[PDB]
PDB file of all heavy atoms in Angstrom:
ATOM      1  N   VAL G 237      27.627  20.762   0.517  1.00 14.98           N
ATOM      2  CA  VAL G 237      27.171  21.774  -0.430  1.00 14.98           C
ATOM      3  C   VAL G 237      26.792  23.051   0.315  1.00 14.98           C
ATOM      4  O   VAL G 237      26.574  23.062   1.526  1.00 14.98           O
ATOM      5  CB  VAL G 237      25.972  21.288  -1.274  1.00 14.98           C
ATOM      6  CG1 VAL G 237      26.381  20.091  -2.128  1.00 14.98           C
ATOM      7  CG2 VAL G 237      24.773  20.941  -0.394  1.00 14.98           C
ATOM      8  N   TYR G 238      26.722  24.143  -0.449  1.00 13.42           N
ATOM      9  CA  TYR G 238      26.337  25.451   0.067  1.00 13.42           C
ATOM     10  C   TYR G 238      24.831  25.464   0.332  1.00 13.42           C
ATOM     11  O   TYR G 238      24.075  24.653  -0.216  1.00 13.42           O
ATOM     12  CB  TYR G 238      26.738  26.530  -0.948  1.00 13.42           C
ATOM     13  CG  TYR G 238      26.308  27.952  -0.653  1.00 13.42           C
ATOM     14  CD1 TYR G 238      26.651  28.569   0.542  1.00 13.42           C
ATOM     15  CD2 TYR G 238      25.652  28.710  -1.612  1.00 13.42           C
ATOM     16  CE1 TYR G 238      26.282  29.883   0.803  1.00 13.42           C
ATOM     17  CE2 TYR G 238      25.279  30.016  -1.363  1.00 13.42           C
ATOM     18  CZ  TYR G 238      25.599  30.596  -0.157  1.00 13.42           C
ATOM     19  OH  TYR G 238      25.233  31.901   0.086  1.00 13.42           O
ATOM     20  N   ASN G 239      24.384  26.393   1.184  1.00 11.44           N
ATOM     21  CA  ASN G 239      22.986  26.450   1.615  1.00 11.44           C
ATOM     22  C   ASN G 239      22.085  27.087   0.536  1.00 11.44           C
ATOM     23  O   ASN G 239      21.346  28.037   0.769  1.00 11.44           O
ATOM     24  CB  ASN G 239      22.882  27.186   2.947  1.00 11.44           C
ATOM     25  CG  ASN G 239      23.145  28.681   2.836  1.00 11.44           C
ATOM     26  OD1 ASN G 239      23.597  29.178   1.804  1.00 11.44           O
ATOM     27  ND2 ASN G 239      22.853  29.407   3.904  1.00 11.44           N
ATOM     28  N   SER G 240      22.141  26.514  -0.657  1.00 11.50           N
ATOM     29  CA  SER G 240      21.420  27.067  -1.792  1.00 11.50           C
ATOM     30  C   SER G 240      19.965  26.608  -1.789  1.00 11.50           C
ATOM     31  O   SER G 240      19.668  25.439  -1.540  1.00 11.50           O
ATOM     32  CB  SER G 240      22.094  26.661  -3.103  1.00 11.50           C
ATOM     33  OG  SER G 240      23.336  27.335  -3.256  1.00 11.50           O
ATOM     34  N   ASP G 241      19.066  27.550  -2.068  1.00 10.23           N
ATOM     35  CA  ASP G 241      17.629  27.289  -2.081  1.00 10.23           C
ATOM     36  C   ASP G 241      17.175  26.435  -3.258  1.00 10.23           C
ATOM     37  O   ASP G 241      16.015  25.999  -3.266  1.00 10.23           O
ATOM     38  CB  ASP G 241      16.864  28.621  -2.083  1.00 10.23           C
ATOM     39  CG  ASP G 241      17.142  29.456  -3.318  1.00 10.23           C
ATOM     40  OD1 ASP G 241      17.957  29.042  -4.169  1.00 10.23           O
ATOM     41  OD2 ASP G 241      16.528  30.534  -3.455  1.00 10.23           O
ATOM     42  N   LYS G 242      18.035  26.183  -4.244  1.00  7.85           N
ATOM     43  CA  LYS G 242      17.665  25.419  -5.429  1.00  7.85           C
ATOM     44  C   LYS G 242      17.780  23.914  -5.235  1.00  7.85           C
ATOM     45  O   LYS G 242      17.687  23.168  -6.214  1.00  7.85           O
ATOM     46  CB  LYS G 242      18.532  25.851  -6.621  1.00  7.85           C
ATOM     47  CG  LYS G 242      18.557  27.359  -6.873  1.00  7.85           C
ATOM     48  CD  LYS G 242      17.161  27.961  -6.938  1.00  7.85           C
ATOM     49  CE  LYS G 242      17.177  29.341  -7.575  1.00  7.85           C
ATOM     50  NZ  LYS G 242      18.225  30.225  -6.978  1.00  7.85           N
ATOM     51  N   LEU G 243      17.990  23.442  -4.004  1.00  5.83           N
ATOM     52  CA  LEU G 243      18.115  22.028  -3.701  1.00  5.83           C
ATOM     53  C   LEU G 243      17.220  21.664  -2.526  1.00  5.83           C
ATOM     54  O   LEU G 243      16.927  22.514  -1.680  1.00  5.83           O
ATOM     55  CB  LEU G 243      19.566  21.655  -3.358  1.00  5.83           C
ATOM     56  CG  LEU G 243      20.606  21.820  -4.462  1.00  5.83           C
ATOM     57  CD1 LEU G 243      22.004  21.668  -3.882  1.00  5.83           C
ATOM     58  CD2 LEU G 243      20.377  20.814  -5.586  1.00  5.83           C
ATOM     59  N   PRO G 244      16.759  20.411  -2.439  1.00  7.59           N
ATOM     60  CA  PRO G 244      16.032  19.981  -1.239  1.00  7.59           C
ATOM     61  C   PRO G 244      16.989  19.659  -0.102  1.00  7.59           C
ATOM     62  O   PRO G 244      18.125  19.229  -0.317  1.00  7.59           O
ATOM     63  CB  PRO G 244      15.280  18.733  -1.709  1.00  7.59           C
ATOM     64  CG  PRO G 244      16.141  18.169  -2.781  1.00  7.59           C
ATOM     65  CD  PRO G 244      16.797  19.345  -3.459  1.00  7.59           C
TER      66      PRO G 244
END
Side-chain angles (χ1 to χ4, degrees):
Chain G
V237 298
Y238 174 56
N239 71 350
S240 289
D241 63 358
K242 308 309 196 311
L243 296 169

